[PDB]
Amino acid sequence: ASEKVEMNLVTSQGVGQSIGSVTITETDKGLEFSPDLKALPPGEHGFHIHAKGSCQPATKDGKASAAESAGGHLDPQNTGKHEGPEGAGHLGDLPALVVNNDGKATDAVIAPRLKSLDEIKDKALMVHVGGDNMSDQPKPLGGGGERYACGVIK
Ligand SMILES: [Cu+2]
Ligand SMILES: [Zn+2]
């Protein structure tokens, strides 16, 4: 089974233009995330599933913050740690999203720990401005920084 999630730009003032979609499919080796995105800054970007199915801004962190409404990283086991797709932390930690020099992301990625679409229903798929070193050191949540794009999983 699979599901298509449309992604949009987010700012501290709301949700912007659509930048494509990501389709998620259940495979023998876990959930596969096959992006078809454009208009993204080239480089590697933090890619995680957040706890709430909302991309709206919220005023937490000395002001308004883009898609802050989605809460933290999905973690139903309350591990409290950020360790990556192959770690034992947040269940929502996905391998990083690599954007090419044309500003597109088209390479599929796998999360072996996720096994069913049922597990991520009504959650938010997020893309960060910063990367992800899959650790809380030396920067929290892998140095992801601000939220750049977001989509809600129906
Ligand atoms: Cu995130
Ligand atoms: Zn995390």
- Closest-lying ligand to the alpha carbon of 74? 2
Alpha-carbon distance 119 to 35, whole Å?
19
The answer to whether 128 is annotated as binding is yes
Q: What is the SS3 assignment for 102?
A: coil
Q: Where are the domains of the chain?
A: 1-154
Q: Collect all residues with Cβ–Cβ distance below 8 Å to 129 and sequence separation of at least 6.
A: 41, 45, 144, 145, 146, 147, 148
Bridge partners for 32 per DSSP: 25, 110
Give percent helix, percent strand, percent coil of the chain, each to the nearest 5: 5, 40, 50
- Closest-lying ligand to the alpha carbon of 142? 2
Q: What is the resolution of this structure in A?
A: 2.0
Q: Collect all residues with Cβ–Cβ distance below 8 Å to 77 and sequence separation of at least 6.
A: 91
- Closest-lying ligand to the alpha carbon of 144? 1
Q: How many CB atoms lie within 10 A of CB 100?
A: 12
Residue 28 alpha carbon to ligand 1 centre in Å: 25
Q: Collect all residues with Cβ–Cβ distance below 8 Å to 45 and sequence separation of at least 6.
A: 96, 97, 98, 99, 127, 128, 129, 130, 131, 132, 148
Alpha-carbon distance 15 to 69, whole Å?
12
Alpha-carbon distance 106 to 114, whole Å?
21
1-154 to CATH, choices 3.40.50.1820, 2.60.40.420, 2.60.40.200, 1.10.10.10: 2.60.40.200
Element (H, E) at 34: strand 30-37
Q: Which residue has the tokens 């000395």?
A: 62
| Experimental technique for the deposited model | X-ray
**What DSSP state is assigned to residue 117?**
G
**Where do runs of H (alpha helix) occur along 74-151?**
none
Q: How many CB atoms lie within 10 A of CB 101?
A: 7
Of 146, 138, 153, residue with least CA distance to 46: 146
